[PDB]
């Protein structure tokens, strides 16, 4: 019970950190067209990882 | 039921975003021999992650 | 039994290696504001992955 | 049955591709002390991911 909830909470933290990485790569691309594509893909991965955390919560 | 299907759908989105990252690293390598090796490996990871999403669907 | 314990031990090793990556990116940022943000996010991911390993142990 | 075996096979492919990434980052570091640390950490992650694939096989 509590173990699966701990896993979901940890996965939520991972999604938040991956979104922070996407923003930083955006700023690197500003300082680039290919790097911007990487940052937008990383943002989509963060969104999907947050969806996984919620589904694990439902389990 | 619906939770495991949500996980598979999210993993499919992750594989699509990782394939987008592989293409972008390819274009960086054009702008490199080692970087091209990284892009080809990332493409194989995207292919394997999509296989994982389908197997989770079967579960 | 032993298989789930093996998975947790492997995930612990992954968290240790991700923390090593975060430190190395810190040193790259010293040699940078965006790169430092990436290193701090990677450290948080390592912390969360270690939490996942312990929860899998409890399972 | 077959779904869990498919997941293990896919995870084995991911470990092989991550080892290929580690070698490429090694060659980038040759072309660096921090980059070499990243490559050695990525190699350890590939080793751990292969251990996870085998434990999933045992499951």
Residue numbers in the entry:
A (entry chain A), B (entry chain A), C (entry chain A), D (entry chain A): 0 to 30, 37 to 64
Question: Could you share sentences copied from the article?
Answer:
For the antiparallel α-helical barrel proteins, the seeds, models and experimental structures for sc-apCC-6-LLIA and sc-apCC-8 are very similar.
Here we describe efficient routes starting from validated parallel and antiparallel peptide assemblies to design two families of α-helical barrel proteins with central channels that bind small molecules. For targets with antiparallel helices, short loops are sufficient. However, targets with parallel helices require longer connectors; namely, an outer layer of helix–turn–helix–turn–helix motifs that are packed onto the barrels.
